[PDB]
Symmetry: C2
Subunit: 118 residues, 2 copies
């Protein structure tokens, strides 16, 4: 730990498009992702974009997990921002990779609140 939090900005490509358009399943998988990471969920809110697409946010202790899907393109924008030694955003990543069946992913890990800056 050299920062308040760790933030994964993930591009998920060639996903299962049925899953990407399933608002209930996406919400379920996001909550399980949060459980896998060690995080505690404060609130969650998921919405059906029309005609296709799911958007959701899981608020955790001091930060968030988010997903925005484009079923028509097989694409999801995922963000996994966790704080604390106890919580591992890569565990959420792995769950979602498997839940969405992405064939290609790109992930960047940012530090949020570096100790040497704050």
């Amino acid at each position: 730990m050299k920062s308040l939090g760790r933030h994964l900005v993930a591009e998920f490509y060639e996903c299962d498009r049925e899953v990407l358009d399933n608002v209930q399943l996406i919400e379920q998988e996001m909550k399980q992702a949060a459980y896998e990471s060690g995080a505690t969920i404060v609130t969650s809110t998921f919405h059906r974009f029309l005609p296709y697409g799911v958007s959701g946010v899981v608020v955790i202790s001091e930060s968030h997990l988010t997903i925005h899907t484009w079923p028509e393109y097989g694409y999801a924008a995922i963000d996994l921002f966790t704080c604390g030694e106890d919580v591992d955003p890569w565990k959420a990543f792995e769950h979602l990779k498997k839940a969405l069946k992405a064939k290609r992913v790109h992930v960047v890990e940012h530090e949020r609140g570096r100790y040497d800056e704050i």
Copy 2:
């Protein structure tokens, strides 16, 4: 050339009383969404311990978020917008002003690049 634009922002040396004011953070975040041109879907703001605010404004197909650390004068801000007439930099400007940040660091990501997804 992408489905969305996403600003990952570090705000430093902010007004610490603002950072711990959940009502004001909600107002300013909603104002920031308005400035950007985004449509609000839902908004949820939390203040929980002994300080610190978390807020999310869910917009059409993406989000604006803030998580504050009053004890450090720091806020973690994310401004993810989609579509050509929504401008996340207008949200940035509003929040920079509202929070009285003296120093900022911002990464702008292209989320869903057309060349990566395979869109002409």
